[PDB]
C-alpha cells in the first residue's frame, strides 16, 4: 500500500508504473539447482 511514511511508498509506484514481477514466481531469474 502506498500509504507509507517514508521512501518505501515511493518504490511501490516506481515498480508498478513499469511492470515489475511481484514477489511470488514467474520471474526472469531462476533459483540455482544443485547437481550430483
Amino acid at each position: 500500500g502506498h500509504m507509507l511514511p517514508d521512501v518505501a511508498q515511493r518504490l511501490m509506484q516506481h515498480l508498478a508504473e513499469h511492470g515489475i514481477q511481484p514477489a511470488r514466481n514467474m520471474a526472469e531469474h531462476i533459483p540455482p539447482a544443485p547437481n550430483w
Binding site: V7, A8, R10, L11, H14, A27, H29
Partner: protein
C-alpha cells in the same frame, strides 16, 4: 546525469542482470525494499532491481533515499 562525481555508486551491491546481491546487500536498503514490498526474489530479478536502482538514483542516490526514511 553522470558528468563527474556521482554520489551513488552504481555497484550498490547490485548486479545489472541478477539484481541486488542480498548477501552483500545493505541492511538499510534491505529495510526499504522490504517496506516497499520488494522481497529477496524481486531484489534478485532483472527488471525489478534495475528499476530499483534507477529509483534510488532518481532521488539523488543512496544517502538521499536513506534521508527520506527520516524525512519523506
Amino acid at each position: 546525469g553522470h558528468m563527474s562525481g556521482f554520489k551513488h555508486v552504481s555497484h550498490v551491491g547490485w548486479d545489472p542482470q541478477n539484481g541486488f546481491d542480498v548477501n552483500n546487500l545493505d541492511p538499510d536498503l534491505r529495510s526499504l525494499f522490504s517496506r516497499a514490498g520488494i522481497s529477496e526474489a524481486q531484489l534478485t530479478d532483472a527488471e525489478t532491481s534495475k528499476l530499483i536502482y534507477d529509483f534510488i538514483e532518481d532521488q539523488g542516490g543512496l544517502e538521499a533515499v536513506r534521508q527520506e526514511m527520516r524525512r519523506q
